[PDB]
Amino acid sequence: RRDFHILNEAEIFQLLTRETVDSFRKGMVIPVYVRKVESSYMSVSTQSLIAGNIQRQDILEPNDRRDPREVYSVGQTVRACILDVDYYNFKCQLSLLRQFTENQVAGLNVNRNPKFWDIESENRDRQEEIDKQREESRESRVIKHPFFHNMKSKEAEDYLAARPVGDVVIRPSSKGSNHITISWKVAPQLYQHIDVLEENKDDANAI
Amino acid sequence: LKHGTYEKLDEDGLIAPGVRVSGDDIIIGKTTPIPPDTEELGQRTKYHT
Amino acid sequence: ELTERGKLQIEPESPYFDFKYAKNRPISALTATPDLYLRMIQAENDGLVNIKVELPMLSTVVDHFYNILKSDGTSEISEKWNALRNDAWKQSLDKLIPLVQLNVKESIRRDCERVLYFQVKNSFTKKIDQAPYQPPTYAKGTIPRVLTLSFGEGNRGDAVLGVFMDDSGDVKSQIKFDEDFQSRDFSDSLTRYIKSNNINPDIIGISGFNIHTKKLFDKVNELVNEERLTIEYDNSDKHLIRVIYVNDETARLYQHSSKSSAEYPNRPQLAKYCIGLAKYIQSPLLEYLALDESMYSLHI
Amino acid sequence: SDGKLLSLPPVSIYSKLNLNPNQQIAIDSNGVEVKVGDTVREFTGERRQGTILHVYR
RNA sequence: GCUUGUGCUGUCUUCGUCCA
């Protein structure tokens, strides 16, 4: 048999942190835990007890001029991106810049060659799911007013048809819950719909 | 332990006269022995007796 | 192909995402990567995906067999006969295709399974192929006297346990260090245990469950480098006693096995873990054998 | 974590993964911290919802 | 980075307080 096998840096790291070198390397986003906040750096801890630090250039955005302590405090965990890993010393440096924490989405290295990958199908499914995300729900509006009636434009005109000239009805507007359509009889078989824009609304159903 | 504070007790477990006390403070510190558990496994003498 | 279940369940993080839209993958290259085909089959069995085998030149074979079968007549009667023959031939192809697809699928499945079986065999052999640690100035195969030190986790209240075993494989003495491992008292007590009691271990093993064990390893290495704790050699550059990390799958499984409890009814779990580490250093093969059924659950 | 089911003897299992709240931490898509027992809803897919039982990676 | 401490009997007896 071969002599006793001595663990190396990668094997020792995997044994201690129970995290593989592949799953913990450059270009990965992990929810680290803030442990100490300082003006020039922030000391954070990962899930696997790996102590990390970030130099002041990356805790806050380059455009912002605030203080690290005001924005982030102890116990406020944030997402971070791995920049460097000291496997021997179990030390890592992180970045809070959104160019890493947000843009890194397709982190897999799957070969997307059109000859062997159906890019068109994945794209089509992508707009399908994005349109599904765009899909929402809407409901009717209820208002309490003596001259308010939940009628269509033609319905309001027909309701005012049986009434003499000058009678007024109020119905929801098609421009949104912040708009109100008022229909009044200008003349026999002649009606005017006037849109009213609402400001400082307490509620969608409120006036 | 009681939820009060033990910081007003002296070395002998008795409070000293002249000390202002409030409700739920500990004025007499007393302990009763308990057979130790298997915590002697890996506790550095920090096991409840 | 993807079913609706496949359309919804294959996420960018799921292992099935590697072949969510694969197309025209060569069969001959599959045998070199058996796990991809195995995972495709597993996803198919889950009702998510559908695997299809197709030939670019299927029309070529159909036309060639038709030309062999078709008649050379040109009359409208011959045209009707040729049409009937071609339609029956197309129906025969429709019936025949699924069976051939299934046969080819089974053949590739067997090939990939055999390849992965051989790969797992080689990985296990590599895992279990290691002779016991050879102390210096001794021939290979000699069983060394070993000392294991461990504390497990390193939280406030984590004493360091020490277990020493001789070359005979029988436990000789177990000691507790109840002071802080960073104190001078810990180092002095460890030095006294190492030297005064004539223990003279050939190699010292250190292991744990987290990164806190690294500091203990560094402290022990510094102590060894400072006190010049050279190995006793039976009757001159005396060599230092080696301190290394120890793989502890077998130790972790041994600390929970009832075999240790029957063997050591009055010992802590950490003592059993240290004994398992020491036995693994003495003889990895026997420790791997001791797993019995739990050896199959090892990450091979 | 993969989504499959296994059957193993109690001995074969390594040990329980005792994790403190300082270790068992979850962050949602928007970056707001979510703790144990909270109710969240899947952003896409089946868009299901439920209470968090355990957080790992 | 050293991190904070949650739990109380029971049964008699007596003497009292406010109405009655």
Ramachandran angles phi, psi of C38, nearest 5°: -60, -40
Evaluate whether D24 touches D54 at the Cβ level (below 8 Å). yes
Question: What count of residues does chain B have?
Answer: 49
Give one word for D45, left, alpha or beta, with left for phi > 0 and alpha for psi -120 to 50: left
Experiment used for this model = cryo-EM
Within an 8 Å CB–CB cutoff, is residue D38 touching chain A?
A: no
Tell me the DSSP string of chain A: -PPPPPP-HHHHHHHHH---TTTSSSS-EEEEEEEEE-SSEEEEE-TTS-EEEEEHHHHS-SS----HHHH--TT--EEEEEEEEETTTTEEEEE--HHHHTT----------TTTB-HHHHHHHHHHHHHHHH-----------TTB----HHHHHHHHHTS-TT-EEEEE-TT-TTEEEEEEEEETTEEEEEEEE--S-SSSS--
Q: Examine chains C and A and say if they touch (3+ CB pairs below 8 A).
A: yes
Residue the block writes with tokens 């271990």: C201
In this complex, the nucleotide whose C1' atom is nearest to the CA atom of residue C155 is E2
For residue A77, give the nearest of A37, A42, A39, A44 by alpha carbon.
A44
Whole-angstrom CA distances from C54 to C37, C67, C101, C222, C289 are 16, 22, 8, 66, 48
Contact C252 D14 (CB under 8 A): yes
Question: Cβ-count burial of B12 within 10 angstroms (0-12 exposed, 13-18 middle, 19+ buried)?
Answer: exposed
Return the axis-axis angle of helices C249-256 and C269-282, rounded to nearest 10°. Answer: 140
C210–A49: do the CB atoms touch at under 8 Å? Answer: yes
Q: Give the count of beta carbons closer than 10 Å to the beta carbon of residue C162.
A: 24
C154: the nucleotide nearest its CA (via C1') is: E2
**What are C288-296's contacts with CB under 8 Å, separation 24+?**
C288/C128, C288/C250, C290/C250, C290/C254, C290/C257, C290/C259, C291/C250, C291/C253, C293/D9, C293/D11, C293/D12, C294/C253, C294/C257, C294/D9, C294/D11, C294/D12, C296/D12
CA distance linking residue B44 with residue C291, whole number of Å: 31
Touching chains B and D? (3+ Cβ pairs < 8 A): no
CA of C127 to C1' of E19 (A): 90
Asked if the Cβ–Cβ distance from A45 to D22 is below 8 Å, we say yes
Chain E, protein-covered positions (CB within 7 A): 1-3, 5-8
First to last CA, chain C: 32
Length A149 CA → E14 C1' (Å): 79
Cβ(C30)–Cβ(C108) below 8 Å: yes
Contact B44, C151 (CB under 8 A): no
| Phi, psi (degrees; rounded to nearest 5) at A102 | -115, -45
Nearest to C174 by CA among C208, C141, C140, C197: C197
**Cross-chain CB nearest to A15 (options C24, C132, C247):** C247
* Closest chain C C-alpha to B39 CA, distance in angstroms: 9
| C24 token code pair | 């025209």
Helix, strand, or coil (residue C245) = strand
Alpha-carbon distance of A192 to A84, in angstroms, equals 70
- Tell the residue number behind the tokens 């250039």, with chain if given: A57
- Nearest one of C217, C272, C277 to C246, comparing CA atoms: C277
Please give the Cα distance from C283 to C297 (Å, whole number). 20
**Measured in whole angstroms, how far is the alpha carbon of residue C109 from the centre of its chain?**
22
**Residues shown for chain D:** 57
Å: A206 CA to E5 C1': 52
DSSP state of C243: E
Under DSSP, the state recorded for C294 is G
Measured in angstroms, the CA of C209 and the nearest CA of chain A are apart by: 6
Q: For residue A61, how many C-alpha atoms fall within 13 Å in the half-sphere facing its CB? A: 6
Q: What tokens does C63 get?
A: 């036309």
User: What is the distance between the alpha carbons of residues C205 and A131, in angstroms, rounded to a whole number?
Assistant: 60
Measured CA to C1', the nucleotide nearest A38 is: E1
Q: Round to whole Å and give the CA distance between C168 and D17.
A: 36
Q: Which helix (H) or strand (E) covers residue B46, if one does?
A: none
**Backbone dihedral region for residue C61 (phi beyond 0: left; psi -120 to 50: alpha; all else: beta):** alpha
Collect all residues with Cβ–Cβ distance below 8 Å to C226 and sequence separation of at least 6: none
- Nearest nucleotide by C1' position to the C158 CA atom: E2
Residue contact C211–A121, C-beta within 8 A? no
C168 Rama class: left (phi>0) / alpha (psi -120 to 50) / beta: alpha
Q: Residue C212, class by beta-carbon neighbours within 10 Å (0-12 exposed, 13-18 middle, 19+ buried)?
A: middle
Rounded Cα distance, C160 and C271, in Å: 10
- A90: chain C residues, CB-CB within 8 Å: 211, 214
Q: How far is the CA of A101 from the C1' of E2 (A)?
A: 32
C277 burial via Cβ count (<10 Å: 0-12, 13-18, 19+)? buried
Residues with CB under 7 A from strand E: A 35-36, 51; B 1-3, 24; C 155-156
Answer for the pair A91, A49: CB distance below 8 angstroms, yes or no.
no
The rounded distance, in Å, linking the Cα atoms of C130 and C192 is 33
Closest approach of chain A CAs to the CA of D31, in angstroms? 7
Relative to beta strand A168-172, strand A179-187 is antiparallel
Q: Is C123 helix (H, G, I), strand (E, B) or coil?
A: helix
Contact (CB<8Å) A79/D27: yes
Residues A104, A106, A111, A116, Cα dihedral to 10°: -150
User: What Å value separates CA A183 and C1' E5?
Assistant: 72
